[PDB]
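Worked example 4.2. Below are the chains of a multi-component assembly; read each line carefully before continuing.
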Amino acid sequence: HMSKQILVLNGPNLGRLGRREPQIYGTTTHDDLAARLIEYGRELGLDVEVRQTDSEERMMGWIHQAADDRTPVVINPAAWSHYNIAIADALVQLVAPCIEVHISNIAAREEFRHHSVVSAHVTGTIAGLGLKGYELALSWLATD
Amino acid sequence: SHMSKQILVLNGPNLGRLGRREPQIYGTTTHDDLAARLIEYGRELGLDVEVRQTDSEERMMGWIHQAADDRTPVVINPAAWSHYNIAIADALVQLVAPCIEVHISNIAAREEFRHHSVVSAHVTGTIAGLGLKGYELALSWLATD
Amino acid sequence: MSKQILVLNGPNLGRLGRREPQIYGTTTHDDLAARLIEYGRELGLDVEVRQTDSEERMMGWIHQAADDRTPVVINPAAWSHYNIAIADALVQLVAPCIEVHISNIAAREEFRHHSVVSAHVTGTIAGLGLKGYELALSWLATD
Amino acid sequence: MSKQILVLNGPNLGRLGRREPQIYGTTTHDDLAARLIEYGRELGLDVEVRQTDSEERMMGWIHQAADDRTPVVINPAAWSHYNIAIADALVQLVAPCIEVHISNIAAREEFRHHSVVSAHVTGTIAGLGLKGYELALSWLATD
Amino acid sequence: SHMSKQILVLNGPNLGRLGRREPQIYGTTTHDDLAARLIEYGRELGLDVEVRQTDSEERMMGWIHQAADDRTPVVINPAAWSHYNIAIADALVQLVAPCIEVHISNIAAREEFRHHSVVSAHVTGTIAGLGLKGYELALSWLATD
Amino acid sequence: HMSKQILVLNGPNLGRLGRREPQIYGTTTHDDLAARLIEYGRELGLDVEVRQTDSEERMMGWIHQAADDRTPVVINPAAWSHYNIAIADALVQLVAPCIEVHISNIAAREEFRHHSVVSAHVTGTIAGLGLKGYELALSWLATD
Amino acid sequence: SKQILVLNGPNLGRLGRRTTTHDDLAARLIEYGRELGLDVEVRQTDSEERMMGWIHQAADDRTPVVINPAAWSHYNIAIADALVQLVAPCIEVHISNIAAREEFRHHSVVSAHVTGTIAGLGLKGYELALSWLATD
Amino acid sequence: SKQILVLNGPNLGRLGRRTTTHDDLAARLIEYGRELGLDVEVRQTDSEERMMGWIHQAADDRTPVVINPAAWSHYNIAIADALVQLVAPCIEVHISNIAAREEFRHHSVVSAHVTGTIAGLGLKGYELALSWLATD
Amino acid sequence: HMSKQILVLNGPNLGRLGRREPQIYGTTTHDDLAARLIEYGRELGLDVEVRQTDSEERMMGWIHQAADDRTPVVINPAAWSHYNIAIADALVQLVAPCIEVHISNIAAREEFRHHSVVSAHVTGTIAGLGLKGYELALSWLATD
Amino acid sequence: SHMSKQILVLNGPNLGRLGRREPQIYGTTTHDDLAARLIEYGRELGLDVEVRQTDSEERMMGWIHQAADDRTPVVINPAAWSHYNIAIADALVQLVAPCIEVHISNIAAREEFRHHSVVSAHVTGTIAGLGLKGYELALSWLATD
Amino acid sequence: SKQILVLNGPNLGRLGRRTTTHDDLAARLIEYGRELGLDVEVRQTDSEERMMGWIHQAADDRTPVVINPAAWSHYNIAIADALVQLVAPCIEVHISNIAAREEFRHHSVVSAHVTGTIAGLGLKGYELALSWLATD
Amino acid sequence: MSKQILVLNGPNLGRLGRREPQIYGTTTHDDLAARLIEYGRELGLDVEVRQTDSEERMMGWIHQAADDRTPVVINPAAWSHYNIAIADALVQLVAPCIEVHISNIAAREEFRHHSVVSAHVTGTIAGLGLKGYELALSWLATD
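Applying the procedure described above to all twelve chains together yields the following structure tokens:
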């Protein structure tokens, strides 16, 4: 209906959610996470789409389309956060709000993980609050 | 909507001047208005929220020590203390129950001296740049934990 | 008998005309390609212009230019700041290679000042807008 | 109708007269306060001078000067090298603010060279001894 | 000489151009010639060797994910990805069976931008500067593990 | 009587001794530590006072009084060691000896804990020798 | 008149000994400029005072400048702060590819303060700067 | 005679184009000095040789100096080493708040070698330096 | 006979192999390692000598003799790798190939262990492959 | 005062010249005088103290290896080796019984090249700036451990 | 003729006030040179333009140079790039032990580009440079 | 009545004549020692020349020169870049000490630019080849 469209974009290695360090990332799969956010979104009157790719080209294409559509974006750039200026430069084209989400507490990990090249270029950032961080981002966008 | 699980929201230096403090960055809501809002939002989630603000690191450390003993989850905005105050970071390491760091402004988008938090490594997680709504997200997280 | 030249544009340059017009102009990538092909023809050059957001596709185009000894004018865009895979492709070029930045990268944020490509190519043009590509072609016309 | 000015002295400055006289003089903080009030009166200024080792108390004085639009002359002393809480209070001032260092901080150890306050105030006077405060008042008398 | 334990050799960007790629550094053998050589050398050690090359980080990550699930030992030459590509490093952390990083050239003897590998901390070990023979050393190691 | 007065000053978080990481800090409380040092001091013919504060203002006041009284100081600045130039500048006013004590081995901890801004400005430093480090400082001052 | 000023900094008077001479370069650019309908003058100095004076006058005259600061590029903030006064475009030219040389040569203090920079394209770099200014 | 020398470094001859001119500043400080019973002279140069000569003569004459090194502040050790020869006080003045500008402007190589520094208080900074020297 | 002579040189603390962190270094002694490499070498038609010293003077003398004899060298400089330019400058005199071996994965350890001052000056480097790394070095030299 | 628990005091380079070595910093006592003093002080605490000094890193490493095998507590003054000598640090990691690093001078108050010790992270703890009495404090600590 | 040029940079005209004067040093080196069968000239300037001109002429004449760049050592790449043009040997002399001074004085931008450097051996350092050139 | 001088050569200098002749010459260490003893004799100096790869042996020679107040000319070779134990021995010398490097260490890799010895000795000669030792002796002849 008049339901606000939101795009959740997950970058490299996040297709493997559930196989990795469960105390940090959970045993929830990417398919389980997508279903959860779509359902959570529906309860908030949001029309949520969830996409994951290991391809920077495909991710840049999704960001370019969100720019053109003025679709709010929740992005987890995963390891690209530490270095990928091509992804940061795509995000600068967005018009609607953009929230960066890290599942793990990147500040508590190795020094090479502390800095995000994305954070300066988005609305805000949520880190270390697990998969629930994505739900917080949707909650914020529901009342924006 | 049954207000029973206790949560402590702790605001550090200069946040008592919310509403007058650089409103183009932090907005026009006063600290009193924010405290009332978070208590009301908490009640809707069945949380019993207390909101406290101080410019005194001694008083803040005392509040953190008591939350450690009480096993009370904490939402803390250390404001400028985030950039350097290892005494505040070392108090937060004593907490047992979860702790969420909140920054109203997007610190990564400001001057380089504001980018690093000495607190972030020592808490559960951090919310930055989502305005006063970031406090409500932290409470939402704690409501279902 | 026209000398073949390859112009290669990297990530986000398919969106030319969308943002920051005072830097990048209001022209689309298709409009830029048509302009450089026409400018090349006037100089007696046979110019091909390609754009990709894919480092695999870009590396393939650089490898073919290395095999063909085709001079290259490359705008690596954000890849300039970090992408050693693209720099390692460019070192294999045999004919000259000119790096072009539309914007004055020295005048921007500190993370944009260093190019990992510049040490590995013939030379670099930065800050002279879309006309920078035409200068690169002018240089290659008399080389 | 005398213009109100606030002089605020930070940590360790209550001990003026105790150590390093060749830098800080042999005058006490009480003697400095009396001198600046008298100097201010001669310029038609109503000067108040306050000193604290408490960052809470200092932040409260800065907040009141922000609310009152009172020009401030501040010597943050050692807080200059690290105290972002004091710098974040000073950014809220509306009327001018002049940072004063009695000593030449550039001539001392490297840990003393950088002030976290200087970017956030109108301007800075360093190395001109107790007279630096009088220069700050002279500037504010004609502003 | 009984070819049964499966090993995966994965070559990253620009290695498809071996033979033409800076031959004074990397030698005159083609990638096809190298693959045939390692399969033959593996067979002599009773290893079943597969050799794959890609310029696509997506395709490489997919190969690493499958080796994680298959518990297949990996010999990887990440080439220029070694200097910066944390996405490739984070894929390799998923491997369970051993992983050996190989660099054909002595990266420590080249420009400063080539000295650091982001991969080395996350694998079993690293061989650098021993030419195409470094791949055979990695297989020799895996034959007796 | 003619017993030498010594001041032991403990900075932030040390009022919580006993609650923290016991393998490093012990299960001894600040009250237990104070009683121990006063008794140990008495055996050495020292009149020991032990004070603890989370307040930099209160600590600076105690250091200023030790400067005026020429009282030797044993100080554990705790986390203030890493950054607090106000505390370092107060200690430069001391006339009698000053020994900095760290309970934990700060060199073996995170890099942000390695540097003390206090060490250059005092007589000497004892680190990693636990609560017994305070007794070593008193032993040194007993024969000074 | 479409006047352009080409300004060469320290040691560039020694071009050919340091095989084209500075005189040969100047004659080439004046001729090349004329072909494009530009009135080009070429000046060289080892004096930062003289160079600053030339830049100040170009600021007042709104004359486009092509500058090769040579070694001043790596440190001379006085020259960078003179160039900030220019109103018309200013193109920095480096004959050599400074990115391919020692690390002390990589950074230019001038680049942030000018329109654009051309590096590594040899003496033809000056002709590209003139070609740019011919159509501006 | 209570003589004071005000020395202005590179690009400061362009004050007002770079709205008070250098001539207007000089006239103001000479007049302000006279009111304080000081005999003030104001000199400006883009030449480090000329500036060094002025500093050497001030050293020999024991004349207090107010210096604005402008961009030389960030790098010019030759000027810093001349200032070390001064016997009477020397006050460094910056018109702008250099701490509030780009990071390359934050450090002065002069500040360690002079009596004191005044920054960010505009052209009135020169008058504060004179006021200090009137009572020294 | 016509068997190729190879020198394996082990630097400081490697005389203690077997006593240290066994999950990394093994429980194999230096004597056991020497016997193993000599036997492995013989199977490859190499005449292997294995020497260990805590003395930089003695190590430099062995490298100088390998330079004069044109003997290929396998060296484990151990902690000297991180700083010892005297050892690096001796290795530059070698004519025949030289392979640097680290038993542990130095890249996975503390930051002070990441950089080797030796690696730029030798043929190549093997790290993190345990005592088997020495056998890989000999295998390489057997077909050189 | 019953001399039975064995303690080893190990002094590194240039400490054999105590008394002549920069006496304004290190004092006028000779190394022989210091050794006699520590043995006597140890005896009063019921410790059997041995004091050894060498300019030879090989000899020092040998002494550390034997203390590892003997489980003998060590008091070490590595002197200038503290700033760089990872071979000495890696020997000390083999010790099982406690180890106390002593610096006679306040290294934090000297040139920047003297501030960092590569040894401190690898020992029990460190005493600096308390002169020759710092050795006696280390023995006092070991007497009650 | 075995001609040697000794070139002194900024502030060295003030030797003795900054107790041997620059004139006393020049007379000493001319006399010392003559004893070694060298024809020595000694020149001093605070002008980088004048110094660059002297270096350019020494390059063309293949005259060995002994240079004391004084504060230019720490930053002046224009002077370093002039010295690269020299054909005959060039010895950099520092009167003081620059390694023992402030950290900003430790690095010379000249040292990489000359034959060798002598530091901390006082005015006798110039005589050692001449002694080296007498037997080269 | 001849003034005694000690020339001390550190690690790898026993191999003089073996490698990089364009820097180090084709002369052996024995040939260099004979040359400096003869050069010293001509200046009225009694010169002894010693070389070691052992930091213990070198520290012992420096300690004896400190006790004897013998001027020292030292080439610490690679120890210059890191060996604080050798620098701490040299600080104990009473008579002058001149550090000599045969090669121009400023012209080599960045790891060779810094000497930990130079701050602690009278002065330094670098890049003037074997003749650098003779210059050091010439300086000591008139001191």
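Take a moment to check your reading of the output against the notes. Residues 1-136 of chain K form a domain with the Rossmann fold fold (CATH 3.40.50.9100). Residues 111 and 117 of chain K are 6 Å apart (CA to CA).
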